[PDB]
Copies of this chain bind each other. A is one copy, B any other.
């Protein structure tokens, strides 16, 4: 037993991280087959970042102005292009460590592992959720742009996120691997609003099931509720509305524990209205919303 926020093993991704430099700006790129993907703001000076005209900036840059380095070894850049907010640098050498991969645009409420890297060197790994407002709560600094978020299904790496920026609230924003931002953000240094950060109700429920599975059950009350009833309470706390799809998705956990989803909702309702009274659930003193039902099943089942 025990339940922990855990990231996917990062080995397959480590082997794809390179350092990309243009002028005095350095960040990370992702080397897959003969292409290196990186944030287009690698072409900006600190001045440019305030209001960059990327089309105009990129035109002053040739292949040889992009310095790409995997370990101590240079890659030869033989082409460049800009796709939305990412550059693709064609190199003359296919990464011999390229794993099977795809590019995916992840839905809000889903989770992924981030391999924090500094100027091409893997630094550490942790789990994030894509929040309903299309931000993540990460740990990023200068040099960590181009670090990627991914999931692994056996041998397939699904890349879903590349890091670009931080908002005034201290949360993080970035793109899929086609360079399209998650959320309304743009890659320039101006103040930008994410909007109200709502709680991922289905994830809270999953974690409450996790807790029950791992012996924590003090919060199981004698009440039930309905979706409409629970959702009237949800709105009040800026929880996402629960739908039947979410009910269905929790099916396996409901079965495994013998606790109806609406009974757990009633329990969640009393926690929201009455707080925790200084108690903890899976060693947290607030309601955790960054574990998906999959995340919970994967851990509690354990196998593979």
A interface with B by C-beta (< 8 Å):
1-12, 14-15, 115-116, 118, 121-126, 137-144, 166, 170-172, 214-215, 275-276, 278, 280, 283-286, 299, 302-304
Contact = CB atoms under 8 A, between A and B. Distances in A.
Contacts of A118: 302-304
A284 B172 CA distance: 18
Contacts of A214: 170
11 contacts: A1-B170, A2-B171, A4-B138, A6-B139, A9-B10, A9-B11, A10-B10, A125-B125, A142-B302, A170-B214, A170-B215
B4 A126 contact: yes
A9 B17 CA distance: 12
A126 B3 CA distance: 11
B121 A6 contact: no
B139 A299 contact: yes
A274 to B, nearest CB: 12
- Per assembly, the copies of the chain total 2
What is the interface of chain A mostly: helix, strand, loop, or mixed? loop
Given A144-B302, A302-B143, A172 B124 contact: no
A123 to B, nearest CB: 7
Contacts of A115: 9
B10 A302 contact: no
Top-10 shortest CB links A-B: A11-B11, A285-B285, A6-B124, A9-B122, A141-B302, A11-B14, A2-B139, A4-B139, A6-B126, A285-B286
Contact of A124 (B7, B140, B142, B278): B7
A284 B140 CA distance: 19
Given A4-B126, A11-B12, A284-B285, 8 more contacts: A1-B141, A4-B137, A6-B116, A6-B139, A8-B124, A11-B14, A118-B302, A284-B284
